[PDB]
Structures are given as C-alpha cells and as structure tokens.
C-alpha cells in the first residue's frame, strides 16, 4: 500500500469554490469534545488510500 496519498473524510462545513484547507484538527463527530485526543465521536479528519 502507498499510504502517502490522502483525502479529507470529515469537515463540519463544505468548501466554497476553490476554498482550500490543510488543517488536521481532530473532528468532533458528536456531543463529546476531542480535547486534541482521538476516540468516541472524535475522529481524525484525513484518511489514506493505501
């Protein structure tokens, strides 16, 4: 697997036309905050094709 190619699976709001966003801050997916640490309803926003 080539893991060096990546895409964003999560964002709270969709991009406007040619809006660009590299920020990797952990996605809070529900009522529990991330505080920067992955877990229950707290997911890394990027993913890899492998």
């Amino acid at each position: 697997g080539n893991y060096n190619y990546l895409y964003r699976l999560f964002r709270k709001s969709n991009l406007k036309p040619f809006e660009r966003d590299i920020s990797t801050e952990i996605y809070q997916a529900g009522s529990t905050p991330c505080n920067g640490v992955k877990g229950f309803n707290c997911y890394f926003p990027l993913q890899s094709y492998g």
Binding site: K16, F18, E19, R20
Partner: protein
C-alpha cells in the same frame, strides 16, 4: 500603517494571509503563521508574492479563492477626517490563495 493580517483563527492552525509594505518592496504570504499577541514593527507555506494632505484608500474582497485588491491615492484638504467629494478606486491585484478569510487586523510601525 505598514501591513495587514487576514485569516480565521490567527494561531498557526491554518494558512493565513499576511501583507506587508516596506521601502524596499511590498510582500504577500499565506503561511501557517504563529502571529504574536501584539503585532507591530519596531524600526508550512504555499503562496508568496512581491512588488494629512493625502489619503490612501483600499478595498479588499475575497471571492471563490481569489483575493482582489483595489486602491486609490489622493491629495485632500479637509484635515479633520474621512472626507466628502468623490473619486473611484482601481484594481491592483487578483491573488489565487483559497483561504477561508473571516477575521483581519492592521499592522502598525514604531520609531
């Protein structure tokens, strides 16, 4: 007045637009800047560019990832403040930067 910051969170968690004017050149950057809590001048990155008898006017507008700048320089006589009468600004630049700009601040200089 010698520059501007534009961005979202202004804290290195994003690309942020920095614009600076100095006597050698005018400079523009979009880097993931860690700004200080009190920006002035005592006399990752993905885009960079380079170039009271008077009033300088500008308009900054951001549309579909392009940051558009219009300007005018004019003599004035009404020394009190922002004057009446009329003259239209003209385009200088149209910058491909893609940033979700929502906050801004001016940059000052000290002797």
């Amino acid at each position: 007045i010698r520059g501007w910051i534009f961005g979202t969170t202004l804290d290195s968690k994003t690309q942020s637009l920095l614009i600076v004017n100095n006597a050698t050149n005018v400079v523009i950057k979009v880097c993931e800047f860690q700004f200080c809590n009190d920006p002035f001048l005592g006399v990752n990155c993905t885009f960079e560019y380079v170039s009271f008898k008077n009033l300088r006017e500008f308009v900054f507008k951001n549309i579909d990832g392009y940051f558009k700048i219009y300007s005018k320089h004019t003599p004035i006589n009404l020394v009190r403040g922002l004057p009446q009468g009329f003259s239209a600004l003209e385009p200088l630049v149209d910058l491909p930067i893609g940033i979700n700009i929502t906050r801004f601040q001016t940059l000052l200089a000290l002797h």
